[PDB]
Amino acid sequence: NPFRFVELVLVVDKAMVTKNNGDLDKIKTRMYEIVNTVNEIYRYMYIHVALVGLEIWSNEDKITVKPEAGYTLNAFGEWRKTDLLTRKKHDNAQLLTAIDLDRVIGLAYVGSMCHPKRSTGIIQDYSEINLVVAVIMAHEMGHNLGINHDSGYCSCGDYACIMRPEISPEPSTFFSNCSYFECWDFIMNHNPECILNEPLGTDIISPPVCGNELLEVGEECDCGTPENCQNECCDAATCKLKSGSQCGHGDCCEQCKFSKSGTECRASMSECDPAEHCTGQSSECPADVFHKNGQPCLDNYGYCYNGNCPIMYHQCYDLFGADVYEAEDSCFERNQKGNYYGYCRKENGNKIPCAPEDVKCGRLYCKDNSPGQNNPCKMFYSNEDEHKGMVLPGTKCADGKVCSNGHCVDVATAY
Numbered sequence: 001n002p003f004r005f006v007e008l009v010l011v012v013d014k015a016m017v018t019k020n021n022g023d024l025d026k027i028k029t030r031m032y033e034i035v036n037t038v039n040e041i042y043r044y045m046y047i048h049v050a051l052v053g054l055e056i057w058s059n060e061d062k063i064t065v066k067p068e069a070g071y072t073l074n075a076f077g078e079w080r081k082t083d084l085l086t087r088k089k090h091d092n093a094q095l096l097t098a099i100d101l102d103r104v105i106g107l108a109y110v111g112s113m114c115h116p117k118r119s120t121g122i123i124q125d126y127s128e129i130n131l132v133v134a135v136i137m138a139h140e141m142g143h144n145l146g147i148n149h150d151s152g153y154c155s156c157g158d159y160a161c162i163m164r165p166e167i168s169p170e171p172s173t174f175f176s177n178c179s180y181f182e183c184w185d186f187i188m189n190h191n192p193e194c195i196l197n198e199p200l201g202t203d204i205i206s207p208p209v210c211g212n213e214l215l216e217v218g219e220e221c222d223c224g225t226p227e228n229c230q231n232e233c234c235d236a237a238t239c240k241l242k243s244g245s246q247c248g249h250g251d252c253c254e255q256c257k258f259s260k261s262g263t264e265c266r267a268s269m270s271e272c273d274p275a276e277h278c279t280g281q282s283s284e285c286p287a288d289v290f291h292k293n294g295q296p297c298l299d300n301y302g303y304c305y306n307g308n309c310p311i312m313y314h315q316c317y318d319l320f321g322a323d324v325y326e327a328e329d330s331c332f333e334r335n336q337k338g339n340y341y342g343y344c345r346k347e348n349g350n351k352i353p354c355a356p357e358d359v360k361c362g363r364l365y366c367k368d369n370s371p372g373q374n375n376p377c378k379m380f381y382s383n384e385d386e387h388k389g390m391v392l393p394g395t396k397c398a399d400g401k402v403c404s405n406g407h408c409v410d411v412a413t414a415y
């Protein structure tokens with residue numbers, strides 16, 4: 001499955017309530033439709049958007065909604081991280097305000113999808129035309145998905161695309177080819193892990209809609225509209241499986257049927273990750289099971305850590321390729337410097353040096369056994385992502401010891 005899922009939560013401020021004369025039912029109904037249109041707009045981007053939560057501040061705003069966008073975006077962000085996200089798990093949150101923002105009609109951090117605070121954006125109820133607001137909502141989520149404004153020859157047909165500097169009076173539902181590549185460039189490089197999981201029917205607060213491509217409660221299947229449906233198992237028009245079909249979706253659903261009992265549905269990462277197999281009775285693949293952390297693995301060279309067996313040797317290979325091995329102990333003393341590359345961990349942004357003991361849990365050093373090479377302490381550093389090149393957590397840093405937050409500690413007390 002190529003599709004990504006953005007579990008969204010919409011927050012509506014007091015102004016919005018006052019604007020709608022206190023009719024919450026009207027507000028909710030409209031929000032449902034808008035998020036449904038945002039989901040269509042994103043079909044092209046191989047992304048789905050589901051409303052998992054809707055909070056209406058009918059009594060009092062939980063933050064001060066100022067016409068000064070920056071202040072509001074920031075305030076709304078902190079609020080999501082310290083309050084909302086603490087009682088409702090979601091990937092992105094948008095604030096719909098009826099207040100007349102200064103100069104802009106929306107605002108959102110860029111390339112911040114999944115970040116507890118920066119995975120947000122504010123939107124002004126600029127118009128009564130649902131599509132107009134939906135486009136603004138999508139546009140702001142776009143910035144979140146590392147997407148920037150269109151320019152030059154970026155197109156989406158002879159239509160005003162979603163990522164234009166300013167909203168069009170005759171808006172469309174199409175993204176520009178630039179927004180596409182840009183969007184996925186973000187998902188490829190940075191890894192918004194939080195949008196991988198497919199939301200569960202019950203997680204969706206919006207009334208189920210047949211044909212929105214979101215398998216929702218009460219529906220056997222949902223392959224979009226009859227025109228877009230590519231599912232031989234589903235009857236697009238009704239969201240009912242064809243007579244004779246056992247399933248219509250799932251890692252264990254093959255040509256409208258349950259995969260044969262025992263067919264692998266979730267591959268094994270390593271020996272510490274036992275693969276799962278289909279039962280033959282369901283279209284769903286059994287839960288992901290991991291062997292216990294701390295369990296010896298790879299011929300007693302490592303200890304299991306969250307389904308993997310991180311070891312110096314493999315970690316070096318992943319960085320410099322074959323015929324490359326772990327460097328001598330002496331090389332690891334560079335991690336005591338506490339400089340730009342030789343540290344053990346980071347405190348609020350400061351690089352902390354490795355204490356003599358935790359030396360093997362900081363920056364990883366490898367030896368090159370090629371002719372004339374000469375460099376005994378090869379290492380990798382890129383201010384693009386400082387963590388890359390750092391020893392993976394759970395890596396066996398010593399006999400009976402594993403790495404934990406830049407500390408070489410006893411396995412027995414590690415987990």
Ligand SMILES: *[C@@H]1O[C@H](CO[C@@H]2O[C@@H](C)[C@@H](O)[C@@H](O)[C@@H]2O)[C@@H](O[C@@H]2O[C@H](CO)[C@@H](O[C@@H]3O[C@H](CO[C@H]4O[C@H](CO)[C@@H](O)[C@H](O)[C@@H]4O[C@@H]4O[C@H](CO)[C@@H](O)[C@H](O)[C@H]4NC(C)=O)[C@@H](O[C@@H]4O[C@H](CO)[C@@H](O)[C@H](O)[C@H]4NC(C)=O)[C@H](O[C@H]4O[C@H](CO)[C@@H](O)[C@H](O)[C@@H]4O[C@@H]4O[C@H](CO)[C@@H](O)[C@H](O)[C@H]4NC(C)=O)[C@@H]3O)[C@H](O)[C@H]2NC(C)=O)[C@H](O)[C@H]1NC(C)=O
Pocket residue numbers: 153154155156157158177178181
């Ligand atoms: C997303 O997908 C897009 C495809 O969309 C498709 O079309 C949509 C409408 C929609 O239907 C959709 O469904 C379709 O898929 C891609 O769009 C393409 O982008 C590239 C650039 O990334 C475009 O190229 C530009 O085109 C500029 C305009 O030239 C065309 O138009 C003029 C006037 O109308 C015409 O005279 C030209 O012959 C040319 O015509 C095109 O020719 C190609 C040939 O293959 C045909 O396929 C097209 O069908 C045809 N289109 C038209 C309009 O009929 C170029 O700029 C012009 O350059 C000349 C000199 O070469 C200059 O005299 C003009 O003033 C100038 N015009 C303007 C207004 O700027 C441009 O070339 C300049 O820039 C490049 C940089 O890329 C330089 O290397 C060159 O030196 C060149 O000149 C210099 O440019 C710099 C600026 O960079 C100036 O500062 C400098 O002074 C200047 N120096 C010179 C030489 O004087 C490129 O050729 C291409 O046309 C788009 N295709 C279409 C169909 O629109 C997106 O790329 C894609 N995005 C991604 C990445 O995914």
Ligand SMILES: [Ca+2]
Pocket residue numbers: 005006007090091194195196197
């Ligand atoms: Ca998610």
Ligand SMILES: [Ca+2]
Pocket residue numbers: 208209210211212213214215216219222
């Ligand atoms: Ca549905």
Ligand SMILES: [Ca+2]
Pocket residue numbers: 266268273274275276287288289290
């Ligand atoms: Ca497993």
Ligand SMILES: [Zn+2]
Pocket residue numbers: 139143149164165
């Ligand atoms: Zn913008």
